[PDB]
C-alpha cells in the first residue's frame, strides 16, 4: 500500500537540511521514513514489505495526544537522519539501522503524562517500570510490534547481530528520559575536555548515542521560528492537561503544568534553552562538529524568545 511511494524531487534536497520541517507533508511521513532508511542503509537492509508493515503499525500505536504523537516521532527520526548523513563514517552499519528505528518508536503509545504523574499517582506503568517509566514502556512496545506476524525487519540479522540491534534501540529509547540527560551530558562534557573520550570505548560510545537521541528528541527547537513557536504550544497543551487532572484530584501542579501561569511561557522556554537545550547542542557540536547547524538554529530561536519576553 505504502510500498509504491516515492518522494517528490522538490523535497530530496530540503530533506537533508537539519532545519527541515515535516509539518506540511502529513500524508508523506511514512514515505519519508522509507526514504530516510533507503538513502542511509540502502534499499536492501529490510524487505520493503516488512518495513512498510512495521511503520504503519508504529503509526497505529502513536496516540492522538498534542505533542508526543506520530508527527513528533517522524521529526525526531529525521534529525537522526540528518545527523547520520553528516557524520556517515563515524557510526556502524548496524547502529544506523537501530538509531533510525529507535527514534521512530521512542515515544510509542505515549499517554501525554510524565513519569512524575505516573509515579505520584501509582499508575501500573510505574508499578512495573520503577524508573524511566514511559521510556521503558516505549521500548517494550517496539518489542511486541517487532514480534507481530511479518513485522520483524531485523529477522535477517544473525542471532548475535539481532541482539546487538535491540540493545542499541533499548539504550537510545532510555536516553530520551530527560532525567538521564543531565548526567549523560555532564559526563560526556568532562570526557571530551579531560581528553579521554574514545569512540572505540563502547561505554563512551553509548553516551554519544544517548546525547544524540536527546538532541533529535528536542529538535523542535532547531527549526524555523514559525515552526518552533507552533510546536511550543503542542507541548504545553499536554503539560497543562497533566496539571488539570492533578487539580481534579485536589493537587496543585508545578508552574510548567499550570495553565494559569501561561504568561510565563517565554520565561520557561528561555530558561529551558539555557538549562537544557543549549548545553545539549553545545556538547553535540563539540563532539560531532558537522552537526553544528542545530546549535545555530537553537540560538536563533533563543533570541526569538528574548525578543518576546522583552516585547519586540
Ligand atoms: C516533568 O515534566 C517532564 C520532564 N520535563 C520535560 C521538559 C521539557 C521538555 N521539552 C520541552 N520543549 C521541547 C519542545 O519544544 C518546547 C520545549 C520543554 N519545555 C519546557 C518548558 O520549561 C518550563 C519550565 C517552567 C515553566 C513555568 C511556567 C511556564 C512555563 C514553563 N516552562 C519543559 N520542557 C522539562 N521537564
Ligand atoms: Mg519520552
Ligand atoms: Zn520524544
From Swiss-Prot:
Record-listed a divalent metal cation 1 binding positions: 72, 106-107, 217
Localisation per UniProt entry: Cytoplasm, Cytosol
Positions bound to 3',5'-cyclic GMP: 68, 269
Superkingdom of the organism of origin: Eukaryota
Active site: 68 (proton donor)
Tissue: Abundant in the putamen and caudate nucleus regions of brain and testis, moderately expressed in the thyroid gland, pituitary gland, thalamus and cerebellum.
Binding site residues for a divalent metal cation 2: 107
Residue positions binding 3',5'-cyclic AMP: 68, 269
Domain PDEase, first and last residues per copy: 1-312
Result after altering residue 107 to A: Loss of activity and of zinc binding
Domain topic, free-text comment: The tandem GAF domains bind cAMP, and regulate enzyme activity. The binding of cAMP stimulates enzyme activity.
Sequence similarity: Belongs to the cyclic nucleotide phosphodiesterase family.
Subunit: Homodimer.
Disease implication from the record: Dyskinesia, limb and orofacial, infantile-onset: An autosomal recessive, early-onset hyperkinetic movement disorder characterized by axial hypotonia, dyskinesia of the limbs and trunk, orofacial dyskinesia, drooling, and dysarthria. The severity of the hyperkinesis is variable. Striatal degeneration, autosomal dominant 2: An autosomal dominant disorder characterized by striatal degeneration and dysfunction of basal ganglia, resulting in hyperkinesis.
Role noted for this protein: Plays a role in signal transduction by regulating the intracellular concentration of cyclic nucleotides. Can hydrolyze both cAMP and cGMP, but has higher affinity for cAMP and is more efficient with cAMP as substrate. May play a critical role in regulating cAMP and cGMP levels in the striatum, a region of the brain that contributes to the control of movement and cognition.
Protein name: cAMP and cAMP-inhibited cGMP 3',5'-cyclic phosphodiesterase 10A
Phylogenetic classification of the source organism: Eukaryota, Metazoa, Chordata, Craniata, Vertebrata
Protein's gene: PDE10A
Amino acid at each position: 500500500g505504502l510500498m509504491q511511494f516515492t518522494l517528490p524531487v522538490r523535497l530530496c534536497k530540503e530533506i537533508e537540511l537539519f532545519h527541515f520541517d515535516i509539518g506540511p507533508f502529513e500524508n508523506m511521513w511514512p514515505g519519508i521514513f522509507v526514504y530516510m532508511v533507503h538513502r542511509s542503509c540502502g534499499t536492501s537492509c529490510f524487505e520493503l514489505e516488512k518495513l512498510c508493515r512495521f511503520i504503519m503499525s508504529v503509526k497505529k500505536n502513536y496516540r492522538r495526544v498534542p505533542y508526543h504523537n506520530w508527527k513528533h516521532a517522524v521529526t525526531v527520526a529525521h534529525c537522526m537522519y540528518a545527523i547520520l548523513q553528516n557524520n556517515h563514517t563515524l557510526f556502524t552499519d548496524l547502529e544506523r539501522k537501530g538509531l533510525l528505528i529507535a527514534c521512530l518508536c521512542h515515544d510509542l503509545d505515549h499517554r501525554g503524562f510524565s513519569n512524575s504523574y505516573l509515579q505520584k499517582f501509582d499508575h501500573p506503568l510505574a508499578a512495573l517500570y520503577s524508573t524511566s517509566t514511559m521510556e521503558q514502556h516505549h521500548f517494550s512496545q517496539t518489542v511486541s510490534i517487532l514480534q507481530l506476524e511479518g513485522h520483524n525487519i531485523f529477522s535477517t540479522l544473525s542471532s548475535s547481530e539481532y541482539e546487538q540491534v535491540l540493545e542499541i534501540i533499548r539504550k537510545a529509547i532510555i536516553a530520551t528520559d530527560l532525567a538521564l540527560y543531565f548526567g549523560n551530558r555532564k559526563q560526556l562534557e568532562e570526557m571530551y575536555q579531560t581528553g579521554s573520550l574514545n569512540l572505540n570505548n563502547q561505554s563512551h560510545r553509548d553516551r554519544v548515542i544517548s546525547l544524540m537521541m536527546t538532541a533529535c528528541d528536542l529538535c523542535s527547537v532547531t527549526k524555523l521560528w514559525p515552526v518552533t513557536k507552533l510546536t511550543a504550544n503542542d507541548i504545553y497543551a499536554e503539560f497543562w492537561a497533566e496539571g488539570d487532572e492533578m487539580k481534579k484530584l485536589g493537587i496543585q501542579p508545578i508552574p510548567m503544568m499550570d495553565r494559569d501561569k501561561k504568561d510565563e511561557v517565554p520565561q520557561g522556554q528561555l530558561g529551558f534553552y539555557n538549562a537544557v537545550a543549549i548545553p545539549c547542542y553545545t556538547t553535540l557540536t563539540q563532539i560531532l562538529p558537522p552537526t553544528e547547524p542545530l546549535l545555530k538554529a537553537c540560538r536563533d530561536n533563543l533570541s526569538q524568545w528574548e525578543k518576546v519576553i522583552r516585547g519586540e
